[PDB]
Amino acid sequence: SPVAGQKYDYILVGGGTAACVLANRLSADGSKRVLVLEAGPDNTSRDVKIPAAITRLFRSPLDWNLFSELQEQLAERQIYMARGRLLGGSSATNATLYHRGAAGDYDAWGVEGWSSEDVLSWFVQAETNADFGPGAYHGSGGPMRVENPRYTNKQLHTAFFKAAEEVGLTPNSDFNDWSHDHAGYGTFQVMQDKGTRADMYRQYLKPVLGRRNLQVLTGAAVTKVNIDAQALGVEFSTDGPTGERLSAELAPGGEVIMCAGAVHTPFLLKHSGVGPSAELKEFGIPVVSNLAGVGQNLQDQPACLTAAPVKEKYDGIAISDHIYNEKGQIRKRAIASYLLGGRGGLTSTGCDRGAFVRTAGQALPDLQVAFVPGMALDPDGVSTYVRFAKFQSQGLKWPSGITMQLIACRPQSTGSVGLKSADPFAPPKLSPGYLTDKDGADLATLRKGIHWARDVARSSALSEYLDGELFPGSGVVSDDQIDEYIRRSIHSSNAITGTCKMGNAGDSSSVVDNQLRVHGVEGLRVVDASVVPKIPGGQTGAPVVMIAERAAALLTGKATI
Ligand SMILES: Cc1cc2nc3c(=O)[nH]c(=O)nc-3n(C[C@H](O)[C@H](O)[C@H](O)COP(=O)(O)OP(=O)(O)OC[C@H]3O[C@@H](n4cnc5c(N)ncnc54)[C@H](O)[C@@H]3O)c2cc1C
Numbered sequence: 001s002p003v004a005g006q007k008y009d010y011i012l013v014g015g016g017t018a019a020c021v022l023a024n025r026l027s028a029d030g031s032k033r034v035l036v037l038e039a040g041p042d043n044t045s046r047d048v049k050i051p052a053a054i055t056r057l058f059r060s061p062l063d064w065n066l067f068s069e070l071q072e073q074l075a076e077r078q079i080y081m082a083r084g085r086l087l088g089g090s091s092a093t094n095a096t097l098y099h100r101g102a103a104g105d106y107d108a109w110g111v112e113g114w115s116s117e118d119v120l121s122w123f124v125q126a127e128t129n130a131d132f133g134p135g136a137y138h139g140s141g142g143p144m145r146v147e148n149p150r151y152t153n154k155q156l157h158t159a160f161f162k163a164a165e166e167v168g169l170t171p172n173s174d175f176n177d178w179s180h181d182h183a184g185y186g187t188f189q190v191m192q193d194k195g196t197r198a199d200m201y202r203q204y205l206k207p208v209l210g211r212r213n214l215q216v217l218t219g220a221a222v223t224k225v226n227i228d229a230q231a232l233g234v235e236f237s238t239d240g241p242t243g244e245r246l247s248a249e250l251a252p253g254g255e256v257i258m259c260a261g262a263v264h265t266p267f268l269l270k271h272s273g274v275g276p277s278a279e280l281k282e283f284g285i286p287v288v289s290n291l292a293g294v295g296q297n298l299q300d301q302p303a304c305l306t307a308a309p310v311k312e313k314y315d316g317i318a319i320s321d322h323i324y325n326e327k328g329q330i331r332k333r334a335i336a337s338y339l340l341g342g343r344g345g346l347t348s349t350g351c352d353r354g355a356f357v358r359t360a361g362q363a364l365p366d367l368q369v370a371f372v373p374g375m376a377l378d379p380d381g382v383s384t385y386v387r388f389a390k391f392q393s394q395g396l397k398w399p400s401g402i403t404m405q406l407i408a409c410r411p412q413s414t415g416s417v418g419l420k421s422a423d424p425f426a427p428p429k430l431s432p433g434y435l436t437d438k439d440g441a442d443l444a445t446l447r448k449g450i451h452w453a454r455d456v457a458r459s460s461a462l463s464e465y466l467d468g469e470l471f472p473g474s475g476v477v478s479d480d481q482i483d484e485y486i487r488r489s490i491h492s493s494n495a496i497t498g499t500c501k502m503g504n505a506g507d508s509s510s511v512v513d514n515q516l517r518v519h520g521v522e523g524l525r526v527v528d529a530s531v532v533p534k535i536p537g538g539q540t541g542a543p544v545v546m547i548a549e550r551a552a553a554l555l556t557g558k559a560t561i
């Protein structure tokens with residue numbers, strides 16, 4: 001009906017991070033007709049624009065509300081795995097932390113055309129940085145907005161940096177400068193524009209919407225890719241399960257580009273008969289291409305946390321004191337600094353200072369620390385954000401304190417995504433696989449992370465401010481007690497890469513080639529976090545945008561690869 005008698009040179013499945021970038025580059029010269037299909041709504045919520053309102057996006061109608069299969073190894077728990085559901089995708093709902101990891105992470109892919117020397121200039125092309133001048137590591141011209149966070153907690157941010165130095169860490173002035181070693185303490189830059197979320201809808205898609213060759217449908221859930229093997233286009237509903245199934249057709253030479261993210265791309269490819277035959281057979285799905293790797297190599301960065309209250313003399317100095325009054329009302333001072341100056345607590349996603357640490361002489365840091373100048377009231381950091389949102393207007397005072405989140409940033413465990421039913425509107429079968437690596441390296445990383453965070457809090461610099469420890473608490477002393485606390489509290493830092501991994505020729509574990517072309521289908525590609533062979537250290541948004549920029553340069557003939 002909206003797609004009736006139309007032919008497309010590109011159909012983008014999903015309108016998320018990578019999709020927004022491609023919708024921009026692919027529709028640029030005007031020759032090519034581009035369709036974007038997004039299950040979620042338009043990007044208009046105020047909870048998207050204001051960074052601190054990330055607290056409200058968790059477990060909201062703008063999230064997929066995904067829960068994992070029971071995890072035997074995690075105290076028999078289902079794990080929440082947040083994913084954005086709207087134009088912009090997870091760039092619209094994330095913590096805005098701007099990280100690339102280290103050159104070593106790209107060299108460790110071992111995929112021809114995709115070394116550190118190859119990807120660098122693509123990071124730079126994407127970026128306008130407010131706080132680093134232009135050079136080999138920073139752009140001044142690209143659609144992304146990157147800045148130093150516009151909120152500083154003068155007492156607790158200073159205390160954390162002094163504490164990190166006190167325990168023997170060196171400062172890193174730029175976690176994204178590949179001439180520096182990745183390890184050290186300092187500030188995480190954010191994907192913000194003077195304290196407004198700079199998601200890839202705002203930066204890439206929204207400025208080019210008036211282009212006549214670009215069509216974008218929202219509330220448009222893709223149920224499968226129509227394949228003949230050669231991609232014909234895709235099927236979708238414009239009213240969810242109980243809505244008419246339409247179909248969208250490629251023009252001659254046209255391609256379907258999968259941009260439904262490391263969770264939904266493999267789910268859709270499987271419902272499209274691409275992935276392991278046995279999984280397909282289980283639900284009477286015809287096998288079009290039998291690929292081992294579809295839904296495999298799920299890499300996510302797991303987290304735990306410590307948290308401590310401030311001494312009574314420091315009541316009122318926390319970010320929670322800057323955002324909420326003693327009755328849980330948003331402070332009129334916070335709203336004013338935000339709207340008049342793009343300053344203050346509402347510009348914060350909380351977790352934008354920290355460190356990369358080697359717990360045991362690894363080639364690259366295994367541990368990322370995110371310091372928060374506010375106290376966790378749930379050992380699950382993501383649950384704490386949900387409760388912080390739900391706390392508003394409850395007539396209660398959030399206690400002043402700090403959190404350190406510990407993230408296994410180069411993890412050795414892998415998980416999977418597959419099918420629980422034949423209904424393409426059914427939640428996928430999600431297994432994060434945290435703490436399954438055979439050497440128990442990921443648990444070792446987080447356990448040593450807890451020891452590190454306790455040394456930092458017991459430092460003279462943080463001892464000044466802190467009064468005891470709430471999580472894990474003085475009950476948790478031995479390494480076995482620490483590991484048990486981790487099993488019970490472990491949560492996502494919300495990466496998720498690797499589920500349609502790219503590989504060299506003659507790697508049967510791979511799903512796409514170095515050109516992002518799906519093995520044994522013609523005119524079908526994947527351009528999202530699915531393709532990352534081995535997850536880099538740090539949050540995964542900037543690497544997705546770098547892959548999208550390079551994919552678009554490839555598709556429009558401006559570069560090889
Ligand atoms: C809560 C959270 C916090 C994060 N924090 C950070 C951080 O601070 N910094 C950072 O760099 N990274 C962060 N990340 C990760 C980062 O946001 C993602 O890695 C990146 O945005 C992935 O982009 P993508 O295009 O691969 O997927 P997405 O951006 O998730 O795009 C997938 C899109 O496909 C849509 N879709 C799914 N199924 C269908 C269907 N059937 N039909 C149509 N559309 C469909 C989804 O609704 C979504 O809009 C965070 C992630 C989350 C979820």
Ligand SMILES: CCCCCCCCCCCCCCCCCC(=O)O
Pocket residue numbers: 046049050052053054055056196323330335339346388389392
């Ligand atoms: C706890 C999470 C904080 C949520 C922030 C709520 C802010 C309340 C202000 C409501 C009215 C003023 C709106 C000002 C700006 C709204 C969006 C924008 O245009 O940037």
Ligand SMILES: CCCCCCCCCCCCCCCCCC(=O)O
Pocket residue numbers: 052055094095097303305319320348349350351370372374375376377380381382384385388403405492493494539
């Ligand atoms: C915004 C103010 C929050 C106050 C509550 C403090 C509790 C801290 C919990 C730990 C941080 C959770 C981060 C969730 C966002 C995901 C980002 C990431 O870790 O990559």
